Scaffold this motif. Sequence first.
Motif, PDB file in Angstrom:
ATOM      1  N   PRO A 120       0.079  22.534  -0.444  1.00 34.63           N
ATOM      2  CA  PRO A 120       0.427  21.445   0.481  1.00 34.63           C
ATOM      3  C   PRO A 120       0.460  20.086  -0.205  1.00 34.63           C
ATOM      4  N   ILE A 121       1.240  19.172   0.378  1.00 40.68           N
ATOM      5  CA  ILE A 121       1.361  17.813  -0.148  1.00 40.68           C
ATOM      6  C   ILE A 121       0.203  16.945   0.332  1.00 40.68           C
ATOM      7  N   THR A 122      -0.432  17.335   1.439  1.00 37.02           N
ATOM      8  CA  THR A 122      -1.574  16.586   1.941  1.00 37.02           C
ATOM      9  C   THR A 122      -2.692  16.494   0.912  1.00 37.02           C
ATOM     10  N   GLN A 123      -2.778  17.445  -0.022  1.00 30.78           N
ATOM     11  CA  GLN A 123      -3.741  17.320  -1.109  1.00 30.78           C
ATOM     12  C   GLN A 123      -3.400  16.143  -2.014  1.00 30.78           C
ATOM     13  N   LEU A 124      -2.113  15.953  -2.312  1.00 30.19           N
ATOM     14  CA  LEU A 124      -1.702  14.781  -3.075  1.00 30.19           C
ATOM     15  C   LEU A 124      -2.017  13.501  -2.315  1.00 30.19           C
ATOM     16  N   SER A 125      -1.784  13.502  -1.000  1.00 29.04           N
ATOM     17  CA  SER A 125      -2.134  12.332  -0.199  1.00 29.04           C
ATOM     18  C   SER A 125      -3.632  12.043  -0.254  1.00 29.04           C
TER      19      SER A 125
ATOM     20  N   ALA B 103       6.248   0.899 -20.735  1.00 28.66           N
ATOM     21  CA  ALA B 103       5.246   1.912 -20.416  1.00 28.66           C
ATOM     22  C   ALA B 103       5.884   3.158 -19.815  1.00 28.66           C
ATOM     23  N   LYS B 104       6.883   2.981 -18.957  1.00 25.96           N
ATOM     24  CA  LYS B 104       7.614   4.107 -18.395  1.00 25.96           C
ATOM     25  C   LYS B 104       8.823   4.495 -19.231  1.00 25.96           C
ATOM     26  N   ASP B 105       9.079   3.781 -20.327  1.00 20.06           N
ATOM     27  CA  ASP B 105      10.244   4.016 -21.178  1.00 20.06           C
ATOM     28  C   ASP B 105      11.537   3.953 -20.377  1.00 20.06           C
TER      29      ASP B 105
HETATM   30  N1  LIG Z   1       0.649   8.819  -0.253  1.00 18.21           N
HETATM   31  C1  LIG Z   1       1.579   9.568  -0.852  1.00 18.21           C
HETATM   32  N2  LIG Z   1       1.518  10.910  -0.706  1.00 18.21           N
HETATM   33  C2  LIG Z   1       2.445  11.665  -1.301  1.00 18.21           C
HETATM   34  N3  LIG Z   1       3.477  11.282  -2.056  1.00 18.21           N
HETATM   35  C3  LIG Z   1       3.513   9.953  -2.184  1.00 18.21           C
HETATM   36  C4  LIG Z   1       2.627   9.043  -1.630  1.00 18.21           C
HETATM   37  N4  LIG Z   1       2.976   7.745  -1.972  1.00 18.21           N
HETATM   38  C5  LIG Z   1       4.045   7.899  -2.713  1.00 18.21           C
HETATM   39  N5  LIG Z   1       4.429   9.204  -2.881  1.00 18.21           N
HETATM   40  C6  LIG Z   1       5.570   9.681  -3.652  1.00 18.21           C
HETATM   41  O1  LIG Z   1       5.772   8.777  -4.718  1.00 18.21           O
HETATM   42  C7  LIG Z   1       7.174   8.480  -4.881  1.00 18.21           C
HETATM   43  C8  LIG Z   1       7.398   7.002  -4.674  1.00 18.21           C
HETATM   44  O2  LIG Z   1       8.436   6.528  -5.557  1.00 18.21           O
HETATM   45  P1  LIG Z   1       8.129   6.170  -7.063  1.00 18.21           P
HETATM   46  O3  LIG Z   1       9.183   5.313  -7.643  1.00 18.21           O
HETATM   47  O4  LIG Z   1       6.718   5.591  -7.146  1.00 18.21           O
HETATM   48  O5  LIG Z   1       8.099   7.600  -7.751  1.00 18.21           O
HETATM   49  P2  LIG Z   1       7.826   8.183  -9.205  1.00 18.21           P
HETATM   50  O6  LIG Z   1       8.440   9.510  -9.391  1.00 18.21           O
HETATM   51  O7  LIG Z   1       6.320   8.118  -9.439  1.00 18.21           O
HETATM   52  O8  LIG Z   1       8.501   7.082 -10.118  1.00 18.21           O
HETATM   53  P3  LIG Z   1       8.692   6.726 -11.656  1.00 18.21           P
HETATM   54  O9  LIG Z   1      10.087   7.251 -12.000  1.00 18.21           O
HETATM   55  O10 LIG Z   1       8.541   5.260 -11.871  1.00 18.21           O
HETATM   56  O11 LIG Z   1       7.646   7.575 -12.378  1.00 18.21           O
HETATM   57  C9  LIG Z   1       7.926   9.394  -3.915  1.00 18.21           C
HETATM   58  O12 LIG Z   1       8.433  10.550  -4.572  1.00 18.21           O
HETATM   59  C10 LIG Z   1       6.874   9.735  -2.856  1.00 18.21           C
HETATM   60  O13 LIG Z   1       7.074  11.046  -2.344  1.00 18.21           O
END
Ligand SMILES: Nc1ncnc2c1ncn2[C@@H]1O[C@H](COP(=O)(O)OP(=O)(O)OP(=O)(O)O)[C@@H](O)[C@H]1O
Lengths: 591, 136, 279, 370
Positions: free
Chosen positions: A291-296, A402-404
Amino acid sequence: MKYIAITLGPITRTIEMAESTKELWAASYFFSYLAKKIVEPFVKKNRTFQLPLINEEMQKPHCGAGLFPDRYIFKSEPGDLELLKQHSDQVLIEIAGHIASPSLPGTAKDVSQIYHYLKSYIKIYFIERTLESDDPHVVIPACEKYLNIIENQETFPEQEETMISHQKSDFLKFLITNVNGKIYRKDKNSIPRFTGSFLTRDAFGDMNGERLFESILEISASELNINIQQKALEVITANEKYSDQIWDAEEIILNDNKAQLRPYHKYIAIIKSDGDSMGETIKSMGAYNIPITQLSKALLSFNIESINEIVAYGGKPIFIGGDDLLCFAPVCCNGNNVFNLVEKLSTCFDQCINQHLQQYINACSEAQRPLPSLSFGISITYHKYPMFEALHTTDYLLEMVAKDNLFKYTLSNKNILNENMKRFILKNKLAFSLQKHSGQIYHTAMSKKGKSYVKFNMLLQKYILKNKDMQESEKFLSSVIQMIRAHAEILQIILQNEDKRTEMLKNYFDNNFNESCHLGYTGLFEDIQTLLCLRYQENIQDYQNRNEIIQQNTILTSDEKEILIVSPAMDAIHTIFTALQFIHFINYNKD
Amino acid sequence: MKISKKQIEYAIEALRANNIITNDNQYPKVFKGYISSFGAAVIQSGLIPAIIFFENEDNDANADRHKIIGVLKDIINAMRQQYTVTDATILVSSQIPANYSMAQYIIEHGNTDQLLKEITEAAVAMKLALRMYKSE
Amino acid sequence: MTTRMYVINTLSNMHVGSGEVNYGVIANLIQRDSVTNLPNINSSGLKGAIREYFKENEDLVRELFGSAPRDEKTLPGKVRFFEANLLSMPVRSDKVPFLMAISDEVLQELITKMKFFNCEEATQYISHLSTLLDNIKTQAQGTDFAYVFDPLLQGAIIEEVSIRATCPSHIPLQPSLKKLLGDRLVILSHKYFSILSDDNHLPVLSRNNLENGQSANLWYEQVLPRYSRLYFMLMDGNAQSEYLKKFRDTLCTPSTIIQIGANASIGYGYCQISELSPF
Amino acid sequence: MNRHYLITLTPMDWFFFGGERTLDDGKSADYISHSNKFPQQSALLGMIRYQLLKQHNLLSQFPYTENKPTEKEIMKTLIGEQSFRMTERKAKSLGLGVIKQISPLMLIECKDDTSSRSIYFPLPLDDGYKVSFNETSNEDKVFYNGIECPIPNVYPASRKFFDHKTYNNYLFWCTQGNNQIKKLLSDEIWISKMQIGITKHVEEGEDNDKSFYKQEFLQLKKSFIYAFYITLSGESELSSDIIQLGGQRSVFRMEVESIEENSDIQEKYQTAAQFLTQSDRLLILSPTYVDNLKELSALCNFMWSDSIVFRNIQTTNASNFYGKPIKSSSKYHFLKPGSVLYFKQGKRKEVEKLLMDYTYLRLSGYNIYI
Ligand SMILES: Nc1ncnc2c1ncn2[C@@H]1O[C@H](COP(=O)(O)OP(=O)(O)OP(=O)(O)O)[C@@H](O)[C@H]1O
Ligand SMILES: C[S@@+](CC[C@H](N)C(=O)[O-])C[C@H]1O[C@@H](n2cnc3c(N)ncnc32)[C@H](O)[C@@H]1O
Ligand SMILES: [Mn+2]
């Protein structure tokens, strides 16, 4: 079923409108507060939230920082679109009333034009989609891609009515530039205190340690343990607008503490961070059933602990939410330098990812997958420096370096971004720059996915003088800094040597520093050699194939190729040189 | 002046070829004094007498002091290679024969300070490159 | 009463400040053109130096340069100063103490700017400079060159680039061309000139601040060699003729010395301004 | 009758078209000033009027002065009584003298040939992508600050969806090829340098107001020039001269060329822009000033638009020409060139009517579209 997604407003323009850090924090907290107010009716109605995890922890004021992002995805039941519509202007009337209050400086108001200006400027967009899935994992990317294209619709106030004494229409500038209040004499005999506004009242309250925020030098010197704010507020209140005098008084009082003053007390570090490739982390949390809620949850815990750690170091958070971070920290504070704070925030990120995403790490990254990462951009400047240009430098360091994204942008502008060239994109980097009072820049980039970052942190901690104690620290040789710069070509020759570079480096440093006074600096020489070798290995492993594919890519001209081609040994030498210069800059005082 | 990387590379190659640096990256510890003394002697006494002194093989020296002249010759040959060839160039670019000894070469071709300049740079390169090795 | 070309003969070292964020060992670096990277003087610096010299002549300053800052009534200036571009540079030699170095690209840029600006007395100079450049390219045949125009100066060595100077006996340098470009003149390839005018080959000076024997500070400063020549363009917006005549007479007199640079008290940047003489 | 000219401007030096939070604005005067890539059309009008008075020897000199009635009337008949003013945005006449209409300033590339000049335009924001706008009953819908609009499905016309990271259309300018639109990066047209300036004397001063100002000076690449078309009342004449257009005395060269008569310059500009036309969108070629953006968004669903700030210097024939000029009391926000207005089915006519109802702004080359 029904899903509702919201994008909040023009954050970049409002940030650019700011001029100092108070205006910047006010602008960030304005959007955080707007999102808070918009989503509170739905949170209290207990809707199913997908993008953020709006639990009870975010609603509590956490050291006066914005945790609420600009994107939210709902699970809609029929009957919430129109109440969202009505709350969209309910919030606008509420803000118009809040600005139209004598608690803030000025001369009268009018709610109607404030509301019209806000509706013209603040772009509240919400999308309604009826898609067939009960799985958030396809829901959030689908809504996000539509939100991204939805963002590009320009609503602005057509007429802006300015000067003419007071018929103000730049109400957001009014709010940000006067966000702390008035000095409010309180009597004949008082300690002065600022009035406050809806932003700084929704933020930290009145539970002690709430002496709001003003100027920059108390941030940059929050260790001297004598009261910057009141010692400088007495000076201005002893006479007859808001920030420049008290800032002017603050440099006077800080200069008056010459006995313990150290050069870094006038230098301020802007720290910006972003999550390294979290969309692909979502996709990999995809194919593998998690689940994505773990990332949240992990991002929530990281945000809370990041605010705690930043305020512990002595830094002021501006916006920590989602995967994004911005902070204002001193160069040094109580034996900890800025890089210690960066390392602590990085470790907080790894700890939270471990705690909440244990299934993902245990099931995927071990086979083959990059773990979620955090990239850092640090800029150190004089206090009397343009804030806008400092933030531009921080953004450049974070994104382009930093992100190139310089590699990606140069390749994509000319349409060369093949998949094999996208394999060579690099993340997990620390972009650090320092501008003196003169203009001399020390900039370097390091990869945090290795032992070079660890050794760099240990070297900094080892050879930085700790004034707070007064037993001793290993001494520093300032002549090694000029040796690294002057002998850079020979050092490059040593580094490019295979399977003899360690002995050769040891021999070179011993044979160059062959005097009896150098018998005490063997530890420093050894640490420098180890760090240099580690950085060269990291740089070759990161850049050799990338450079040899850039070199024979006959679509780019020589100038862009040269701006894209990085020499591994030379970059390692530059990184060691910049670290040594930072050590010397922190250590050296001019008594 | 800065340090010429190419000349340091030539010094490394010449030190390895002329058998001053052993296989375990080491030298007999008298050669650093040899190079420093060569520079000082060239300044103080002149090119030809210093070259004759350090190129002499019937010496009561601790080690083979004449090897530094071979290193000098190799460095000068290497730098005369990759000399640009334009009709406005003051450099000769002609390679010193391995048959020729350095002293006779300067005697029969020595009318210009090109050899002095090249020898000074070669000696400096030797000095800086020898610091990358260890002394037995 | 139109565009005019002025020539700056520098009598000492010149340090016109950049203020740019230095990356290397030299702290104070001189001004260079953004494109060509050759040393240059900004329009602001020229205007400030000329205004400072004429500071006692209040009416001339008001009519020609404009109003003072922090003043009121803020009247505009009639004369417009342009960028001062490096024309000729002194380089070290063995037969002579120095040779004055001119490039073919700087010559072509001078011709192009004189055409574009339409300098007053420029039609003759353009023709003779074009003939000289074409003769030089005919004699060079695409190879890198260094040409002297004095038979005594044949065989000269430019030491930094290690180049021998040759004398083409059939390439004539007219006396006005000498009076413009310089006395001991070498026309060389722009690669050699850019090597001779880069940061590694410019005169770098060490400086320090001493407090009772202990040094407080140390820095390195870049300067432009003395006797260098810089040309700039002047347009007068149909200004008052008598004030303009006073301006030209004062600038073109031999005894006038102008200070342009970042160290007035130690003699940095004292120049002499010459107007384009008839050919 | 009327006389039509094409006016080419060549930069003699580094120019400065500045304005918004510029220097000496007060309120943290912000010594760092960045140059706008183009001048406002008001600057073009003022330059034309200034040169018109120069040719007839009718300028103001010396400290504050007066005017006799007959030169006042000849200035009336030549330039007009009042500068370009925003309040006259719906006036059917230009309210100026011999000047009738000017085209929006156009970027022109002059190759070393008798071959004609290539006209360069900002790249449309929708170029490279297709917007499908599927609307058959409620299937998807978005509210822009409380207005109902369809859903903008955007795909790269090369499926995938709009990746804003890939989006770089705002950095490009376009011109016509054989059948391929030629894309040029903005950096390959304008090069910028930062200048540091001070006052040497050092007196009582405060930051942003004493010394140490930084200004962005722009240079235009070799073969590029600025141009526009002008219509004059026919009793006047425009002569080639050297002009001041922009800030910090940015000096240009006028080449005045007479184009053949009976030529509507608006049709000429639109013919130049014809190669960027798309049947489903209105391409904003020059800044537009709809008085209600909500009204415009009512009939347009996806407005791929940006914003530029406009502020004007307001002077009359009798004004202190040596003093702080009177600036327009209101800041006017204009639609950036290259903006895209996507309309509903039909309804193109009344959105065009809203755009063209500012005939005064249409005459001063502002609300021009294709
Ligand atoms: N609280 C959150 N829970 C889950 N996903 C999140 C949350 N906040 C942001 N995201 C994810 O982060 C991303 C926001 O865009 P962002 O430009 O920060 O992505 P990124 O892939 O980290 O970028 P970068 O190319 O600079 O590495 C989206 O893909 C979104 O799904
Ligand atoms: C990177 S730019 C692109 C996003 C776009 N400008 C927008 O705001 O919709 C803006 C970024 O600032 C960050 N941000 C969001 N809310 C913020 C706030 N209240 N204060 C500061 N930064 C914020 C988010 O990471 C957001 O993506
Ligand atoms: Mn982010």
